[PDB]
Amino acid sequence: VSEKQLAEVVANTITPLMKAQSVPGMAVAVIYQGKPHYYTFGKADIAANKPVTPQTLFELGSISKTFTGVLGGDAIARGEISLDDPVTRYWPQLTGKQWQGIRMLDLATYTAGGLPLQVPDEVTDNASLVRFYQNWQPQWKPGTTRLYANASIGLFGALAVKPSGMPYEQAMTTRVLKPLKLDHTWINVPKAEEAHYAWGYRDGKAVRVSPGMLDAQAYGVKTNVQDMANWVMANMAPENVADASLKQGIALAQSRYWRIGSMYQGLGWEMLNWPVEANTVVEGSDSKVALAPLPVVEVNPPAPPVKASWVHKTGSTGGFGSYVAFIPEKQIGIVMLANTSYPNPARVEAAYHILEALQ
Ligand SMILES: *C(=O)C1=CNC(C(=O)O)=CS[C@@H]1c1cn(C)nn1
């Protein structure tokens, strides 16, 4: 392995990084040789002088969508839901003619026809929620245009769990977190755990995410670098997942539904074929692309996960910035949590280099 050389590669990547982007603290895990390697830097809480630790809770931001995808995926494999089914199958009060051709897959993979990045600030409840989607007008027709959005995968998450009869948070805990024994992963941090909760920093001001409609589904999950490492591992080598529906869930989430250039969308996760040059992934991480509606090319029928992939997901909040990546065929991976939202391509800049030192 070369643990000495390994603590060198990470320190020599992360310290300049943290200095350059003004990051108070970071928790890193590299998985290599079937093992997670934990490395910690700086401060969780600077006014309190609390050091970062492998049980420091960071807000994952958009990386919560990977959890939303496996859940949704587990419900599929359970038979409670199907991607081809019209959305209206699970929410018949969605009465617009607009909603006609949109299947569940569309919501799941951002291709309804233009659902917006975030959910409006006025949407504060289900009524307001329904008026929103009732009176939302497309732009493009179903299955024609990828536009990353919370209002899209958020609604999939919320609809996906209805047949379970469980609220979203209990379903997530029951069908996904506990089975994988992610016992320090929360949608809501218990009072008894807040001391492990890092502070975020935005403009030299400590901040923490605020509640919003559909948050848990699209950005509101919080972890430590240990549960996150085990999460990457369960998805990386799903072969030792007991529960047959969860392993299949992981599988549907890393299936390719849509080809968008060098990238292929899954449920929450995104993929590229390996090998992939650094800058194609790095520039692909730029918001110039990331948040831009691009056309799409159906993978029909959806291909099951290909080990030969760089699968990853970026995600942030006000004061937090994280990123995770893996290469199933290489059995190598990395987690980078930080309490400062710093440039996304900086993130993949670092993770790529660290990973290539292991090849
Ligand atoms: C997910 O990463 C996430 C990061 N901020 C963004 C974005 O598009 O990158 C808006 S969507 C999502 C988020 C974070 N918050 C607080 N709300 N949505």
Side-chain angles (χ1 to χ4, degrees):
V1 38
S2 274
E3 246 52 28
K4 320 298 202 191
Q5 315 198 73
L6 181 59
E8 306 196 311
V9 150
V10 173
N12 300 348
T13 313
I14 286 59
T15 299
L17 214 204
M18 297 176 62
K19 161 164 292 172
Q21 303 297 165
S22 292
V23 179
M26 179 161 341
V28 182
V30 175
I31 122 92
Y32 179 53
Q33 322 200 98
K35 192 168 305 103
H37 295 290
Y38 304 110
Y39 311 93
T40 284
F41 303 88
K43 316 259 180 245
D45 181 342
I46 48 222
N49 222 132
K50 280 204 209 203
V52 169
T53 289
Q55 50 218 246
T56 304
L57 302 176
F58 294 76
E59 295 159 2
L60 254 33
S62 286
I63 297 184
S64 329
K65 290 176 175 55
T66 50
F67 287 93
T68 306
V70 179
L71 187 56
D74 170 87
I76 292 170
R78 265 166 194 278
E80 308 171 336
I81 247 73
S82 179
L83 260 12
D84 11 294
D85 301 332
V87 179
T88 158
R89 222 267 72 72
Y90 306 104
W91 209 20
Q93 45 241 240
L94 215 49
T95 26
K97 251 188 97 173
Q98 8 175 44
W99 284 105
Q100 224 96 266
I102 326 179
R103 341 93 112 170
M104 286 291 271
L105 181 72
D106 291 309
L107 280 184
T109 60
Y110 321 111
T111 178
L115 290 170
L117 177 71
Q118 234 130 303
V119 163
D121 52 295
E122 280 334 79
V123 181
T124 71
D125 49 54
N126 315 342
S128 53
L129 191 67
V130 99
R131 309 167 202 152
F132 171 65
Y133 290 107
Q134 276 255 51
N135 296 123
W136 154 77
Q137 225 265 136
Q139 274 250 3
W140 313 271
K141 283 290 166 245
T144 72
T145 287
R146 186 187 181 293
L147 182 61
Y148 186 84
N150 300 342
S152 180
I153 195 195
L155 182 58
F156 172 77
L159 251 27
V161 64
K162 273 168 108 125
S164 89
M166 278 177 301
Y168 188 82
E169 175 175 42
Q170 155 185 358
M172 174 75 72
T173 304
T174 302
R175 320 236 258 206
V176 172
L177 302 186
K178 274 167 156 35
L180 303 163
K181 265 308 118 208
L182 303 180
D183 298 313
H184 287 99
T185 305
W186 321 90
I187 299 175
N188 300 306
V189 167
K191 170 59 199 147
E193 307 273 336
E194 207 244 271
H196 298 124
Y197 198 176
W199 272 104
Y201 296 92
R202 181 65 177 180
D203 270 357
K205 308 191 87 114
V207 290
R208 267 164 184 183
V209 74
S210 38
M213 289 288 308
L214 264 28
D215 43 14
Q217 293 82 0
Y219 56 82
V221 169
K222 302 124 225 172
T223 358
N224 76 37
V225 84
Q226 291 177 265
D227 278 14
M228 196 59 178
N230 273 315
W231 173 245
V232 172
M233 293 196 284
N235 283 92
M236 148 162 264
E239 40 255 14
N240 17 234
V241 165
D243 296 7
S245 66
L246 219 197
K247 181 199 324 274
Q248 173 58 210
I250 291 150
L252 302 171
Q254 267 176 251
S255 283
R256 291 136 160 223
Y257 299 93
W258 296 119
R259 196 220 282 168
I260 302 98
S262 39
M263 170 247 194
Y264 302 76
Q265 177 82 36
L267 294 356
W269 292 114
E270 311 171 15
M271 290 75 63
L272 299 99
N273 299 70
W274 191 252
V276 74
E277 234 51 17
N279 260 351
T280 44
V281 186
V282 164
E283 293 139 23
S285 78
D286 204 318
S287 264
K288 255 148 219 315
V289 254
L291 305 198
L294 295 149
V296 62
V297 175
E298 209 139 286
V299 176
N300 195 300
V306 4
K307 306 296 114 197
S309 319
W310 175 278
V311 10
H312 67 338
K313 184 74 174 89
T314 87
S316 339
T317 62
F320 285 79
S322 316
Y323 179 73
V324 305
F326 65 91
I327 299 161
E329 151 106 324
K330 269 196 216 294
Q331 288 299 285
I332 73 189
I334 188 172
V335 190
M336 296 173 56
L337 318 182
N339 52 350
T340 256
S341 181
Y342 67 90
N344 282 345
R347 313 197 187 167
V348 44
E349 260 269 83
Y352 201 93
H353 183 21
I354 306 200
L355 287 182
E356 50 112 33
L358 325 184
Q359 277 149 237

